[PDB]
Design brief:
CATH architecture of chain A: 3-Layer(aba) Sandwich
Pfam family, one (chains A, B): Phage_endo_I
Strand order of the largest sheet of chain A: 4-5-6-7
Strand content of chain A: 15-25%
Oligomer: homodimer
CATH class of chain A: Alpha Beta
Order of helices and strands of chain A: HEEEEEHEHEHE
Helix content of chain A: 25-40%
Catalytic activity (chains A, B): Endonucleolytic cleavage to 5'-phosphooligonucleotide end-products
Shape of chain A: elongated
Organism (chains A, B): Escherichia phage T7 (Bacteriophage T7)
Radius of gyration of chain A: 24 Å
Bound molecules: manganese (II) ion
Subunit structure (chains A, B): Homodimer.
Number of strands of chain A: 8
EC number (chains A, B): 3.1.21.2
């Protein structure tokens, strides 16, 4: 960058030796705690997240919850599941869900989901509003 | 939102009793491993990072490195230490550095830093590029 060049030129002009980008320093970013509030909870225990724009951190969040709370049934209703992950991506929101086992639909909750037999929700692992 | 409105109306028309944002699901964003490569290493053991724009994640990284590698001497040379942390912030890069004990300078490496007595760098704690 202009600054790196100026600093390098200065050190050389004064005859100071130096190593440039020669050493890496390892570090760990600590794990962090968060909470996610799905939009709707149906009587049969299915949670439904309505979603327009679906950002990367949001997608990672769903994968984390699936690994951390396998018993939760969290599905997504998209304004459009055909939307691509980003400006030039080949993958759609829907394809991402298919790849990771996330049940999804577009615009409205499918009649079939509402009809699914009730199942237990581990509310003990959850926090009420 | 529009989608939330349409889904809730669909559920209400079918007489489905739902809970809206009534439950919070706790989750953890996993610790992550990284490496940081300072721009310059001077003969006396001082590492210097040249920096123009200095974003929030970059500032956080520097604090993590100071906590996890207290044996290293990492300083920063800014294009301008007067720059505010972000649009609207009353705090400058320099003030942030002062608060956290980070030595800094503007435009070039201080001749006085170059003159400081050599101190051994624990290379066994680092990884060569
Ligand atoms: Mn919501
Ligand atoms: Mn939503
Ligand atoms: Mn660099
Ligand atoms: Mn730099």
């Amino acid at each position: 960058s202009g600054l790196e060049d100026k600093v390098s030129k200065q050190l050389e002009s004064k005859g100071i030796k130096f190593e440039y980008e020669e050493w890496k320093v390892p570090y760990v970013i600590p794990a962090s705690n968060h909470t996610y509030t799905p939009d709707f909870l149906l009587p049969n225990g299915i949670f439904v997240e309505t979603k327009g724009l679906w950002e990367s951190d949001d997608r990672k969040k769903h994968l984390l919850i699936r690994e951390q709370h396998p018993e939760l049934d969290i599905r997504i209703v998209f304004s459009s599941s055909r939307t691509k992950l980003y400006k030039g991506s080949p993958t759609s929101y829907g394809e991402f869900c298919e790849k990771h086992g996330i049940k999804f639909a577009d615009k409205l909750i499918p009649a079939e989901w509402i009809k699914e037999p009730k199942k237990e929700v581990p509310f003990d692992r959850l926090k009420r509003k």
